[PDB]
Design a protein around this ligand. Structure first.
Ligand SMILES: *[C@@H]1O[C@H](CO)[C@@H](O[C@@H]2O[C@H](CO)[C@@H](O)[C@H](O)[C@H]2NC(C)=O)[C@H](O)[C@H]1NC(C)=O
Ligand SMILES: *[C@@H]1O[C@H](CO)[C@@H](O[C@@H]2O[C@H](CO)[C@@H](O)[C@H](O)[C@H]2NC(C)=O)[C@H](O)[C@H]1NC(C)=O
Ligand SMILES: *[C@@H]1O[C@H](CO)[C@@H](O[C@@H]2O[C@H](CO)[C@@H](O)[C@H](O)[C@H]2NC(C)=O)[C@H](O)[C@H]1NC(C)=O
Ligand SMILES: *[C@@H]1O[C@H](CO)[C@@H](O)[C@H](O)[C@H]1NC(C)=O
Ligand SMILES: *[C@@H]1O[C@H](CO)[C@@H](O)[C@H](O)[C@H]1NC(C)=O
Ligand SMILES: *[C@@H]1O[C@H](CO)[C@@H](O)[C@H](O)[C@H]1NC(C)=O
Ligand SMILES: *[C@@H]1O[C@H](CO)[C@@H](O)[C@H](O)[C@H]1NC(C)=O
Ligand SMILES: *[C@@H]1O[C@H](CO)[C@@H](O)[C@H](O)[C@H]1NC(C)=O
Ligand SMILES: *[C@@H]1O[C@H](CO)[C@@H](O)[C@H](O)[C@H]1NC(C)=O
Lengths: 322, 183, 195
């Protein structure tokens, strides 16, 4: 709220800001435009499908293990195990003392319905494959949605059926290793830790400038009206008014530039949850390094984490060709 | 004004231990939050008062004239302190006391009644609530739904194959250029 | 139904409606801002040079010179950011019209929801409207499936298709349209043994 940030509970300071005229309206109108768009950004990513597909009540998906990713009813917050860490490594007084004109509006989608959309994408990508993103969601096993995903590589289907269990064990060991690597690495959630840090840094610098002189004698508003006769006060509180208004324009202008790169990354995640997840992409080094197989979306606070699965050739030989 | 400090707030107690010479109290954001009483030695506290804004939940003006209101970040057990109904008209005090009261993490809206049925969203409210105008002549605030449950029957030898198709035409719209200008 | 749908729902052309509404509002707010005071005497430049003594007047009109300069600086800065989100959509239209129109695209959910067939550009005021002709399956039928088949000790695999059955006969068909055929060597290639 412009009025409360620039002037406190002062009645005569409200009329001085009114003399500037129509400056504060642009600030609120810009900030809503971001706040509406932030609730829009979640809908293009997690809400690619409308029918919330129920998770299968029976395990043993062909020979693989999806316990780490598929939600566990024994938990009191209905989330999955790998998602369980992701809510602890990322951190967020913290939100209570900022009430000096500013506020933190709650998101329209909470952490439960986001955890249900992710649990709906996961339950369709297992028993249906890519169909459920183009019409009625059909049904097909998972030891087959894998053999029709080696066919896009060019390695054909003889590699999966034959020698089936080792590929099951390689996938099982690979999903076991990803839990430990996220725990120890310092920057594992580096791209989301600094996002919540930058907003914390931006608000703290904005609120720390309320106690600055800006060329005046003091940063207090009501006391300097009584230590000084009326002409001087006007000839000094303009400095505090133009100091904080320029200090609030800098905060707003940074947010539009910052929101222009989250939207550049929401659209990169809206085109990654619709090509890697709902299909198989042939764009090189797009859906994971190497040849692509599938993906598994997972949620995170103010972000999203994709869990790619790739195919990388290994031991090689020498031959004579014609 | 006690201990030489001008300001507004709520004087309550807390669990602190001041030093025998320390007098004021300040936080990270550099504001007063703990003032020791000169006459009596104990630990006090200062909390902010009221704040928050309002939102006029209205349908189309061709269909209704009565409106709801939303109080962001105000507990329903202490609205009339933050409403201050002594200075307000009884027309405005309808949204101060009454049977229709509701609490959520987004706020404490009033003038609308919660309904248990769930269907598609019309006007967003906050933290998973949507409001719509259903008749008669009242505004409801239901819980937003995400859709129906297909509940696909997964099996190890079940395949579904379509036997007919449809051809559809989808229209999408993009801006290409805004209006040129010069000054 | 396309002609009826755009002429019915009034939010068919909302996207482009906000483009001309934002620019109309931006210019209108800019014009009304020069009536402000900015702490000075009045928004008319003539009266200050009339009543005020000349050296002090120069002080009071410094508010109006930088007050309107801050109003143009704010207005220009918004157009700089707003032109970035249009060029992000102009490059998206130049990508769609060079792939969805002049070819058939395999990027899922890029040229229309479903499997893409064609496109048809149409000119709209300050924008473009596409007509993404797509493909959607309709009615599904249950079948019993097996991952392979062996005739004489050696497994067989589909050349391109899925093995299906309806209770007593096994068929190979395509993946997006039901059409059974008889199992021959043209559909099967051998690999390994069926143990
Ligand atoms: C899938 O992986 C989970 C996670 O390791 C397995 O659960 C473990 O099961 C063993 C014995 O069954 C226990 O000793 C571990 O304590 C379990 N881990 C946890 C975290 O509880 C599960 O058995 C695996 N399932 C399949 C089918 O492979
Ligand atoms: C495939 O579906 C189409 C419609 O999507 C069917 O066309 C309809 O057929 C019935 C009877 O044959 C007619 O009464 C309708 O007028 C047709 N609709 C249209 C739009 O033409 C078609 O028959 C279906 N084909 C099969 C083999 O089931
Ligand atoms: C499964 O489909 C096949 C092919 O459509 C059916 O086989 C035909 O059945 C009809 C009627 O019983 C016979 O007149 C044909 O001679 C059969 N074709 C062959 C190649 O034998 C079969 O009946 C279907 N099974 C069920 C349970 O409906
Ligand atoms: C294949 O290339 C040459 C053969 O002349 C030799 O270095 C070796 O056999 C192979 N090199 C590898 C595997 O790096
Ligand atoms: C104005 O009234 C019409 C008539 O029913 C109806 O469209 C609606 O109530 C109002 N229009 C809009 C755009 O809200
Ligand atoms: C509002 O206050 C009541 C008790 O006065 C409390 O139970 C409730 O949790 C509060 N609402 C919040 C904190 O959102
Ligand atoms: C209607 O909603 C209220 C609010 O939670 C709830 O207490 C009540 O049990 C609901 N009624 C029914 C029949 O479920
Ligand atoms: C699961 O697959 C095995 C593989 O032969 C099969 O025997 C079993 O019947 C399947 N389960 C169900 C419920 O059909
Ligand atoms: C047949 O298909 C429908 C999908 O429309 C499914 O609900 C049902 O369980 C299937 N039945 C069998 C026996 O496969």
């Amino acid at each position: 709220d412009c009025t409360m940030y620039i002037c406190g509970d002062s009645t005569e300071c409200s009329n001085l800001l009114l003399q500037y005229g129509s400056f504060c309206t642009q600030l609120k109108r810009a900030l809503t435009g971001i706040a509406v768009e932030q609730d829009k950004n979640t809908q293009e990513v997690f809400a690619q499908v409308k029918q919330i597909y129920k998770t299968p009540p029976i395990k043993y998906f062909g020979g693989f293990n999806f316990s780490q990713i598929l939600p566990d009813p024994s938990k009191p917050s209905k989330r999955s195990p790998i998602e369980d860490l992701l809510f602890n490594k990322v951190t967020l007084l913290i939100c209570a003392q900022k009430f000096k004109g500013l506020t933190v509006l709650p998101p329209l989608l909470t952490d439960e319905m986001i955890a249900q959309y992710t649990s709906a994408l996961l339950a369709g990508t297992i028993t249906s494959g890519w169909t459920f993103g183009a019409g009625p969601a059909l049904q097909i096993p998972f030891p087959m949605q894998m053999a029709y995903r080696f066919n896009g590589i060019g390695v054909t289907q003889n590699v999966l059926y034959e020698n089936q269990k080792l590929i099951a064990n390689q996938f099982n060991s690979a999903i076991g290793k990803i839990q430990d690597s996220l725990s120890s690495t310092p920057s594992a959630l580096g791209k989301l830790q600094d996002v919540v840090n930058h907003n914390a840094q931006a608000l703290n610098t904005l609120v720390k400038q309320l106690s600055s002189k800006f060329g005046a004698i003091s940063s207090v508003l009501n006391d300097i009206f009584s230590r000084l006769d009326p002409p001087e006060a006007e000839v000094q509180i303009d400095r505090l008014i133009t100091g904080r208004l320029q200090s609030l324009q800098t905060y707003v202008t940074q947010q539009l530039i910052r929101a222009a790169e989250i939207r550049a990354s929401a659209n990169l995640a809206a085109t990654k949850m619709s090509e890697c997840v709902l299909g198989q992409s042939k764009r090189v080094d797009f859906c994971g390094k190497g040849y692509h197989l599938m993906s598994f979306p997972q949620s995170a606070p103010h972000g999203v984490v994709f869990l790619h699965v790739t195919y990388v050739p290994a031991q090689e030989k020498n031959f004579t060709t014609a | 004004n006690f201990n030489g400090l001008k300001g507004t707030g709520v004087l309550t107690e807390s669990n602190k231990k001041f030093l025998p010479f320390q007098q004021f109290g300040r936080d990270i954001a550099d504001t007063t939050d703990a003032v020791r009483d000169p006459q009596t030695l104990e630990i006090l506290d200062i909390t902010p008062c009221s704040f928050g804004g309002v939102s006029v939940i209205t349908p189309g003006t061709n269909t209704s004239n009565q409106v709801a209101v939303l109080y962001q970040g105000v507990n329903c057990t202490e609205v009339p302190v933050a409403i201050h109904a002594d200075q307000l008209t009884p027309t405005w005090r309808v949204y101060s006391t009454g049977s229709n009261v509701f609490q959520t993490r987004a706020g404490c809206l009033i003038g609308a009644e919660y309904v248990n049925n769930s269907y598609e969203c019309d006007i967003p409210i906050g933290a998973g609530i949507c409001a719509s105008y259903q008749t008669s002549q009242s505004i409801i605030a239901y819980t937003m739904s995400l859709g129906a449950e297909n509940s696909v029957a997964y099996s190890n030898n079940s395949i579904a194959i379509p036997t007919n198709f449809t051809i559809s035409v989808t229209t999408e719209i993009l801006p290409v250029s805004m209006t040129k200008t010069s000054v | 139904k396309i002609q009826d749908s755009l002429s019915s729902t009034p939010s068919a052309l909302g996207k482009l409606q906000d483009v001309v509404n934002h620019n109309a509002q931006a210019l209108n707010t800019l014009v009304k801002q020069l009536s402000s005071k900015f702490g000075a005497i009045s928004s008319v430049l003539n009266d200050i040079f009339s009543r005020l003594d000349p050296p002090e007047a120069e002080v009071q009109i410094d508010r109006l010179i930088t007050g309107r300069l801050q109003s143009l600086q704010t207005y220009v800065t918004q157009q700089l950011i707003r032109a970035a989100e249009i060029r992000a959509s102009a490059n998206l239209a130049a990508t769609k019209m060079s792939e969805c129109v002049l070819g058939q695209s395999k990027r899922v959910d890029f040229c229309g929801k479903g499997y893409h067939l064609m496109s048809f550009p149409q000119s709209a005021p300050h924008g473009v409207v596409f007509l993404h002709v797509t493909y959607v399956p309709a009615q599904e039928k249950n079948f019993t499936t097996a991952p392979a088949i062996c005739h004489d000790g050696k497994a067989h695999f589909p050349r391109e298709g899925v093995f299906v059955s309806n209770g007593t006969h096994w068929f190979v068909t395509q993946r997006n349209f039901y059409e059974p055929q008889i199992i021959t060597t043209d559909n099967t290639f051998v690999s390994g043994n069926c143990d």
